[PDB]
PDB file of C-alpha atoms (C1' of nucleotides) in Angstrom:
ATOM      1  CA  UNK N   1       0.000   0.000   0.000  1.00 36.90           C
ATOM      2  CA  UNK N   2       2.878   2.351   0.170  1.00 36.27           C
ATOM      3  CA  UNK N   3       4.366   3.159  -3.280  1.00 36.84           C
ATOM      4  CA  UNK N   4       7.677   5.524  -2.149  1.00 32.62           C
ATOM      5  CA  UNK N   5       9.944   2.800  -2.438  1.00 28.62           C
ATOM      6  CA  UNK N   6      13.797   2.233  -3.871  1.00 29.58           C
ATOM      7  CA  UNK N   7      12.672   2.045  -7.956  1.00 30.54           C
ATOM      8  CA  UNK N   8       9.841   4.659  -7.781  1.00 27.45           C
ATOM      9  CA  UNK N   9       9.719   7.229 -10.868  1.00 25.04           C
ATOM     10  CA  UNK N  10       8.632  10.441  -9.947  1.00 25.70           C
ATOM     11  CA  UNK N  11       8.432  13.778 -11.767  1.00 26.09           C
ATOM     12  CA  UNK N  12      10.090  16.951  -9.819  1.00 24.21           C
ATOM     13  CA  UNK N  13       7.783  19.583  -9.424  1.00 24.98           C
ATOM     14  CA  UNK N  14      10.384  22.661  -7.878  1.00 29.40           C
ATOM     15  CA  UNK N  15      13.768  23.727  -7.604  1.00 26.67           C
ATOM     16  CA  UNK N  16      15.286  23.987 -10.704  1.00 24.88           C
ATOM     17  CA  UNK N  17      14.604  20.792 -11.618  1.00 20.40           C
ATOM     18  CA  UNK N  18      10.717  21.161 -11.980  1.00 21.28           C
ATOM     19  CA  UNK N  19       9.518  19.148 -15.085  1.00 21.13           C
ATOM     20  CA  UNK N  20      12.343  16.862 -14.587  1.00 22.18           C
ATOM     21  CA  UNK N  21      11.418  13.035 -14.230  1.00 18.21           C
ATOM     22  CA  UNK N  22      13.175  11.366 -11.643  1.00 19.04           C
ATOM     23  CA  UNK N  23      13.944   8.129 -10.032  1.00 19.02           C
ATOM     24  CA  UNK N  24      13.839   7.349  -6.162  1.00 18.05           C
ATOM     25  CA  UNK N  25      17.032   5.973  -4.861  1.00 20.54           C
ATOM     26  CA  UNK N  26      16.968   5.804  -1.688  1.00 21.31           C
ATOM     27  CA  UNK N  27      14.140   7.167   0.594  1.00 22.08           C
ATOM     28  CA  UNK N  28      14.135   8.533   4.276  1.00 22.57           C
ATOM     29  CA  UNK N  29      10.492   8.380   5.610  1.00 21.55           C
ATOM     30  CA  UNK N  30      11.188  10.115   9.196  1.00 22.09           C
ATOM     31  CA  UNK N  31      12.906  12.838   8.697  1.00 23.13           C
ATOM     32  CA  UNK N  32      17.307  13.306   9.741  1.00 23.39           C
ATOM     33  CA  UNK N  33      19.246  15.472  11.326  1.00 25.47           C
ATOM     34  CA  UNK N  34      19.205  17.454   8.339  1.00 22.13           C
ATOM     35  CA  UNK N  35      15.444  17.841   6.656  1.00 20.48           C
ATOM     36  CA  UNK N  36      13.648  17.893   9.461  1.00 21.37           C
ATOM     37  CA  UNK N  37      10.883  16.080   6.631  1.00 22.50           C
ATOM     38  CA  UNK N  38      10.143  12.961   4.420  1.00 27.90           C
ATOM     39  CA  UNK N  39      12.289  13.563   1.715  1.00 25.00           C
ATOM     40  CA  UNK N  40      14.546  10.920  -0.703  1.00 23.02           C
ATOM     41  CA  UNK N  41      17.796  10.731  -2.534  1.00 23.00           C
ATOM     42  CA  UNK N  42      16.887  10.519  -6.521  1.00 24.82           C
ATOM     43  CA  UNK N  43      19.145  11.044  -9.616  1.00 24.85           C
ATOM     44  CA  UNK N  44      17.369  12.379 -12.811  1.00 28.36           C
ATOM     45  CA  UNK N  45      17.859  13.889 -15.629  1.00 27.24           C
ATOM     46  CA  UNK N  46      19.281  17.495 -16.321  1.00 27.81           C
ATOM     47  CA  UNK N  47      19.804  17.591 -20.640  1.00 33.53           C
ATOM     48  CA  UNK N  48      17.500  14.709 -22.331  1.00 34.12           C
ATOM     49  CA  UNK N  49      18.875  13.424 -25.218  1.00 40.93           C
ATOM     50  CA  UNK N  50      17.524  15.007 -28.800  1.00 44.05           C
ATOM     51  CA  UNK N  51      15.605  12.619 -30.950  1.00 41.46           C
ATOM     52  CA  UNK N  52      17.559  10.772 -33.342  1.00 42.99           C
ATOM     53  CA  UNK N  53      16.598   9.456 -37.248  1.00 42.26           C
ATOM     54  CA  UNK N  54      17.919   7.510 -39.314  1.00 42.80           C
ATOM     55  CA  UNK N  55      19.866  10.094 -41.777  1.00 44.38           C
ATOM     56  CA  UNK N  56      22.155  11.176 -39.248  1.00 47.36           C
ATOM     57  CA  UNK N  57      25.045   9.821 -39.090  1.00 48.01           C
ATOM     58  CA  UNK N  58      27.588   7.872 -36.936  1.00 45.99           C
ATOM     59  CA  UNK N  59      29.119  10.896 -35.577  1.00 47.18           C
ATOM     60  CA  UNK N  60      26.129  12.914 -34.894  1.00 47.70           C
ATOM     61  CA  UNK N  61      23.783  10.394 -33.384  1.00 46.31           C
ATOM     62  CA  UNK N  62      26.818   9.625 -30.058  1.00 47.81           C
ATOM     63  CA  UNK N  63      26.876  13.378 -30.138  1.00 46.93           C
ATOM     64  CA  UNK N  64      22.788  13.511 -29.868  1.00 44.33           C
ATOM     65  CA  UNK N  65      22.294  10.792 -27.421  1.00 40.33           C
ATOM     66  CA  UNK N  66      24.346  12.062 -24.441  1.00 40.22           C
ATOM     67  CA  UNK N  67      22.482  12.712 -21.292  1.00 37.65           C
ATOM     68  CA  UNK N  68      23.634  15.139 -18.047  1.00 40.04           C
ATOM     69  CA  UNK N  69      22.610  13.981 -14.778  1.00 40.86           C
ATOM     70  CA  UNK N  70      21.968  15.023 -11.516  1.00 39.59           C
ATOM     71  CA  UNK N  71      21.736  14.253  -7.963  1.00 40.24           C
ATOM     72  CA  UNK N  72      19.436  16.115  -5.408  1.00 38.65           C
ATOM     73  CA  UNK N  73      17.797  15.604  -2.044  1.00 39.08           C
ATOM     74  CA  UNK N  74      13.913  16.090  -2.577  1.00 40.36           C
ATOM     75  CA  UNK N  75      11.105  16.707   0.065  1.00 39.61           C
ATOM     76  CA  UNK N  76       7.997  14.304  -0.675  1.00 43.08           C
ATOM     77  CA  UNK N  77       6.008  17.469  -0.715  1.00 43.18           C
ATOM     78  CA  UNK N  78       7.744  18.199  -3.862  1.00 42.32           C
ATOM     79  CA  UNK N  79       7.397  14.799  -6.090  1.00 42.65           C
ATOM     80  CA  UNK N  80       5.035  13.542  -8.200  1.00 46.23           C
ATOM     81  CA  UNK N  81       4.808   9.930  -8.354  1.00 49.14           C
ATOM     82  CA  UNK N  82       3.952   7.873 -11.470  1.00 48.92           C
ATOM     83  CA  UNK N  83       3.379   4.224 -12.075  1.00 50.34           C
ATOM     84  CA  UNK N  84       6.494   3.658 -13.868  1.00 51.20           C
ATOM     85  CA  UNK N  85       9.738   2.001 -12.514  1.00 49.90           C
ATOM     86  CA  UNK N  86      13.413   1.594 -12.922  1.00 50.77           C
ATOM     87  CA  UNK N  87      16.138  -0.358 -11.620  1.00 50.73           C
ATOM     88  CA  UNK N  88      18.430   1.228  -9.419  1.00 50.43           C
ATOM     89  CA  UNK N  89      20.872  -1.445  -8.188  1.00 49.25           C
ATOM     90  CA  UNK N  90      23.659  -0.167 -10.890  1.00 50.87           C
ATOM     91  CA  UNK N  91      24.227   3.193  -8.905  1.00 54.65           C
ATOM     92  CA  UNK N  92      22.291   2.491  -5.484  1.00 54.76           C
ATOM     93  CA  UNK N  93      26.247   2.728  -3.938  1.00 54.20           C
ATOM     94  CA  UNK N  94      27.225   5.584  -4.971  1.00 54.57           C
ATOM     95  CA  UNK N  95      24.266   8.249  -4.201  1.00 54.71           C
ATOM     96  CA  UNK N  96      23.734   8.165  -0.455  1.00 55.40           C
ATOM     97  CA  UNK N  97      23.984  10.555   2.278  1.00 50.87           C
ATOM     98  CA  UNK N  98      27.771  10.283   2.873  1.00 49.27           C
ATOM     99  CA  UNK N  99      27.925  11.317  -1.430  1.00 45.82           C
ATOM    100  CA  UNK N 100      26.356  14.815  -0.494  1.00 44.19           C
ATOM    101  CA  UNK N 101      27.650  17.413   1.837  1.00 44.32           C
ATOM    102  CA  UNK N 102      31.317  17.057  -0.234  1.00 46.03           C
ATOM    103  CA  UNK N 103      31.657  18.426  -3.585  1.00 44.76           C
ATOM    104  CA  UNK N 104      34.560  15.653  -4.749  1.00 40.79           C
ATOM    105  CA  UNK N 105      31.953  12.810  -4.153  1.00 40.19           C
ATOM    106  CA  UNK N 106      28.968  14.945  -5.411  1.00 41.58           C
ATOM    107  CA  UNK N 107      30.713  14.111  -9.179  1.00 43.42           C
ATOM    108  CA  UNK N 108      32.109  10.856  -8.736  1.00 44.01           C
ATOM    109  CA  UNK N 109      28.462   9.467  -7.867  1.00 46.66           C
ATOM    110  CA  UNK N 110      27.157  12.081 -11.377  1.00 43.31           C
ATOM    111  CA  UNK N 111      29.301  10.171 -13.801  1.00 44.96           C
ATOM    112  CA  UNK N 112      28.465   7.049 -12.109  1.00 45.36           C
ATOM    113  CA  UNK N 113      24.795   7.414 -12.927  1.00 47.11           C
ATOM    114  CA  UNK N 114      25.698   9.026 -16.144  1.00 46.69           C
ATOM    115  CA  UNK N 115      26.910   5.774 -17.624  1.00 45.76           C
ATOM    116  CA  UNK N 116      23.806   3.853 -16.348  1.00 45.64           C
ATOM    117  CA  UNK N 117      21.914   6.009 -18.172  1.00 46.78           C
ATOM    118  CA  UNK N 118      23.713   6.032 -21.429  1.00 45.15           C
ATOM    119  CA  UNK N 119      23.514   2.302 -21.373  1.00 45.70           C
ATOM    120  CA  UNK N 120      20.056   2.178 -20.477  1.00 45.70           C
ATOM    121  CA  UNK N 121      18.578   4.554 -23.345  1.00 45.10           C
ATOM    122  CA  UNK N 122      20.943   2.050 -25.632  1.00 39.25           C
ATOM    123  CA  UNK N 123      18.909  -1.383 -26.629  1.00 38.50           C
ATOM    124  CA  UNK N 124      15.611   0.728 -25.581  1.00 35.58           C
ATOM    125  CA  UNK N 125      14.023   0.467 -22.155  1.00 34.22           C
ATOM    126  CA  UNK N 126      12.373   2.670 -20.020  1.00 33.84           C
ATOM    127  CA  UNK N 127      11.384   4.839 -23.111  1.00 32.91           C
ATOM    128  CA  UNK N 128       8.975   6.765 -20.705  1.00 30.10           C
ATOM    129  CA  UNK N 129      11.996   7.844 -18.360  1.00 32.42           C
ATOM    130  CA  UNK N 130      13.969   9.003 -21.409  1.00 32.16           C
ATOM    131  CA  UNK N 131      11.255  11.076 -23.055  1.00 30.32           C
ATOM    132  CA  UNK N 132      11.086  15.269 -21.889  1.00 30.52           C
ATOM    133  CA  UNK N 133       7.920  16.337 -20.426  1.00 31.81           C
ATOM    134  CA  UNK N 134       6.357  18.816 -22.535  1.00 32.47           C
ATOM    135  CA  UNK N 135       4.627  21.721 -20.638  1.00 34.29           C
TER     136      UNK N 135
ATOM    137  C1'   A Q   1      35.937  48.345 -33.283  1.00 36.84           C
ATOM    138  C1'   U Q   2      38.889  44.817 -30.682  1.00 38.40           C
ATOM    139  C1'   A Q   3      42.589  42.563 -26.681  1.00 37.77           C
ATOM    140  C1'   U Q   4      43.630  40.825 -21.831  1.00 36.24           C
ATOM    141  C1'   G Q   5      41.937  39.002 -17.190  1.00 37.08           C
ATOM    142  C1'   G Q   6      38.070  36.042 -15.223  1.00 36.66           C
ATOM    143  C1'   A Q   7      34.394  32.201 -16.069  1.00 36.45           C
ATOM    144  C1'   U Q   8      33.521  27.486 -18.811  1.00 36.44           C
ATOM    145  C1'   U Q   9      35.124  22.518 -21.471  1.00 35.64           C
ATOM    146  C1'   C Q  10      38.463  15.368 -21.232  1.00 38.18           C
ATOM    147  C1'   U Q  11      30.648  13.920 -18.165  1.00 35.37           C
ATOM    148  C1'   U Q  12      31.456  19.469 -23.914  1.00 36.10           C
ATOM    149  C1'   C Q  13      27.504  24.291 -23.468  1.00 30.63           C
ATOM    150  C1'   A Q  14      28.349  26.594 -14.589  1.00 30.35           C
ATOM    151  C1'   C Q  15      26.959  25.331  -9.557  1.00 27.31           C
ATOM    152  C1'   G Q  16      24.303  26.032  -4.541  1.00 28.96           C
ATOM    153  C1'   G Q  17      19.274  25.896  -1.771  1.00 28.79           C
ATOM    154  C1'   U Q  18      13.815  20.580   0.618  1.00 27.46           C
ATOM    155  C1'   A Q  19      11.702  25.059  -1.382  1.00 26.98           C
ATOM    156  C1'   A Q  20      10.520  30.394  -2.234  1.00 25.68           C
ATOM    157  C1'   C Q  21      15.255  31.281  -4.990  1.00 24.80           C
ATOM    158  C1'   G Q  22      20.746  32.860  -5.066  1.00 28.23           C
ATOM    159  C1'   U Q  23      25.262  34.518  -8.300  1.00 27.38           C
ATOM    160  C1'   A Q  24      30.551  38.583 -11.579  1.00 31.20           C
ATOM    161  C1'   A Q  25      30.022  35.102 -15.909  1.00 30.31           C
ATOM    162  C1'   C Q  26      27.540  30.488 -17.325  1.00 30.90           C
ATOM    163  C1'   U Q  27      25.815  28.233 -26.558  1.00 33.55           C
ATOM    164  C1'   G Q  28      20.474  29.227 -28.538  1.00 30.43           C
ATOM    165  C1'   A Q  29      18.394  30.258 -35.574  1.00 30.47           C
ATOM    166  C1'   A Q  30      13.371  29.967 -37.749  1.00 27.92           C
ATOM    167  C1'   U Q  31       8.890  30.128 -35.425  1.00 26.10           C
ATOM    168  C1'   G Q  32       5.670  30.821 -31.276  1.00 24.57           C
ATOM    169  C1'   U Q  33       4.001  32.694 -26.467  1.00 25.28           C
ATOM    170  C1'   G Q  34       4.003  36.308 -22.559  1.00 27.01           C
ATOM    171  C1'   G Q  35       5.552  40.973 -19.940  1.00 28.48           C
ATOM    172  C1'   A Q  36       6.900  46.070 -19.838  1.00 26.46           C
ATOM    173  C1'   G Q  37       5.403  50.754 -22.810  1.00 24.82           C
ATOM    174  C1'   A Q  38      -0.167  51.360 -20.749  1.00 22.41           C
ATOM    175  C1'   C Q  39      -3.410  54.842 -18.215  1.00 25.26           C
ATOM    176  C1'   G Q  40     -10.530  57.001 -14.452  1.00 24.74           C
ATOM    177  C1'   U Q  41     -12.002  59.560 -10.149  1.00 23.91           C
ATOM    178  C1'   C Q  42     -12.974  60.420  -4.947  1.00 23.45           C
ATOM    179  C1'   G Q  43     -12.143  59.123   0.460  1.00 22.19           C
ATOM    180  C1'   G Q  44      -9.461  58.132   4.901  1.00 23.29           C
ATOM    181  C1'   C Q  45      -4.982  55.708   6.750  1.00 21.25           C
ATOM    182  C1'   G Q  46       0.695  54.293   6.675  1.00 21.11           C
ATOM    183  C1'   C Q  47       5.626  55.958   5.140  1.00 18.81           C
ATOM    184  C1'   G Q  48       9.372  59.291   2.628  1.00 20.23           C
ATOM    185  C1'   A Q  49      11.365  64.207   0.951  1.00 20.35           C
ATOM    186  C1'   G Q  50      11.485  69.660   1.251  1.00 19.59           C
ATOM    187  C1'   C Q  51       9.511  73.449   4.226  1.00 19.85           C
ATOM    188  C1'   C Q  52       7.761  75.093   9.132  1.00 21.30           C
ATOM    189  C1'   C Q  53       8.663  74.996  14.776  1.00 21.40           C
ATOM    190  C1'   U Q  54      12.455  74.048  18.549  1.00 23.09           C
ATOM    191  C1'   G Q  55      17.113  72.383  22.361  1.00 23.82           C
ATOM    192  C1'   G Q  56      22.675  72.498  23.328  1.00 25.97           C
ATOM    193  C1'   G Q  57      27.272  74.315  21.271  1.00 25.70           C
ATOM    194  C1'   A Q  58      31.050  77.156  17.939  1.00 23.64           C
ATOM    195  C1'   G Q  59      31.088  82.462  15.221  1.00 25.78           C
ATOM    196  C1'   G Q  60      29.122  87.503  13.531  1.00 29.65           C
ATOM    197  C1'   A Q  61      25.429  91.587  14.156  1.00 29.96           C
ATOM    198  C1'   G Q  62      21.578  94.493  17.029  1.00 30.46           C
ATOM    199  C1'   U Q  63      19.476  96.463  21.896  1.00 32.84           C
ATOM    200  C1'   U Q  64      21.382  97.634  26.821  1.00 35.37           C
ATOM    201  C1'   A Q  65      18.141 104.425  31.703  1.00 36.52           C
ATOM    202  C1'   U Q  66      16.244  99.486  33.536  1.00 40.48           C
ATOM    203  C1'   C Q  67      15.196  94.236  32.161  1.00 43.17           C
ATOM    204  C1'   U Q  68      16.287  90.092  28.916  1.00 42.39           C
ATOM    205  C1'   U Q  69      22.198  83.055  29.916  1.00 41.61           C
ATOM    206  C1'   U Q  70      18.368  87.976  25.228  1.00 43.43           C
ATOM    207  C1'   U Q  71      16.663  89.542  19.536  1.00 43.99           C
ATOM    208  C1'   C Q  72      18.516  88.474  14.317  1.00 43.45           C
ATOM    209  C1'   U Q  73      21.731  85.606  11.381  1.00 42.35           C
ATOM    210  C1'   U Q  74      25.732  81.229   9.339  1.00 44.36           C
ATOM    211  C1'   C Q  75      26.502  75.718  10.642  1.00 41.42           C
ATOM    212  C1'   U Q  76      25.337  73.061   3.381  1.00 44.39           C
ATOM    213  C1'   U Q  77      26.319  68.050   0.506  1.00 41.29           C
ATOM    214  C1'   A Q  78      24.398  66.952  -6.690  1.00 42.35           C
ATOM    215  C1'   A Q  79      24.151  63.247 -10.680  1.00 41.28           C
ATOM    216  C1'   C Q  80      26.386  58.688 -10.149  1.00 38.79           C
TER     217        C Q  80
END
RNA sequence: AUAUGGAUUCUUCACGGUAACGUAACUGAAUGUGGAGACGUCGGCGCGAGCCCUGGGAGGAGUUAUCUUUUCUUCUUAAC
């Protein structure tokens, strides 16, 4: 009965990141020290990649399909949830608590997810995840 | 017209904040959408500026038979 969990999707709905979609990570139900709120660690997407035909060629479709990540710390209050999933055991190590609060960890963990992603937009699945909310 | 410094880039086109949002910067053609330009009158209330009134002090002038630590006057600060 409680859909919050580890593979959640969810859709960002302030801070900079508002029309994003996301994917729950790791989530914190009572509060912390910090965030006195419910709130969980998700990594999304920043720069979609740009739809892709078949004219171009080799060396314009790598340059068309990269995709810039991020990692935040979002309050509940502040999520949309959807009915979608997405695995999360390829990068579930590397965004945590410990990752934030240091900026040399904040982009190991970024080009950590950014290779999941790549690979995961290859041999297409998830085709929801990878396709920019228009609004 | 143009150069240097700074910023940015090997994850190519910056990061922080849960968020409202912050910053010295931080690619954006056609086309589209929105904002500013752009707006009546009366009433009381809040605040600002100049003026008016006034205290102490530092100067100058006037009155002084008698009274008045007194009467008058200067003490200012632009765009950016």
């Amino acid at each position: 009965a409680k859909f919050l969990k580890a593979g959640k999707v969810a859709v960002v709905v302030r801070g900079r990141y508002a029309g994003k979609k996301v994917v729950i990570v790791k989530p914190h139900d009572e509060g912390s020290k910090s965030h006195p709120f419910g709130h969980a660690l998700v990594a999304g997407i920043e720069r979609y990649p740009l739809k892709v035909t078949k004219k171009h060629g080799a060396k314009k479709v790598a340059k068309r399909t990269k995709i810039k990540p991020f990692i935040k710390v979002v309050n509940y209050n502040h999520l949309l949830p959807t009915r979608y999933t997405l695995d999360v055991e390829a990068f579930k190590s590397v965004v945590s608590t410990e990752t934030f609060e240091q900026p040399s960890q904040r982009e190991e963990a970024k080009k950590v997810v950014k290779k999941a992603f790549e690979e995961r937009h290859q041999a297409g699945k998830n085709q929801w995840f990878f396709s920019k909310l228009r609004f």
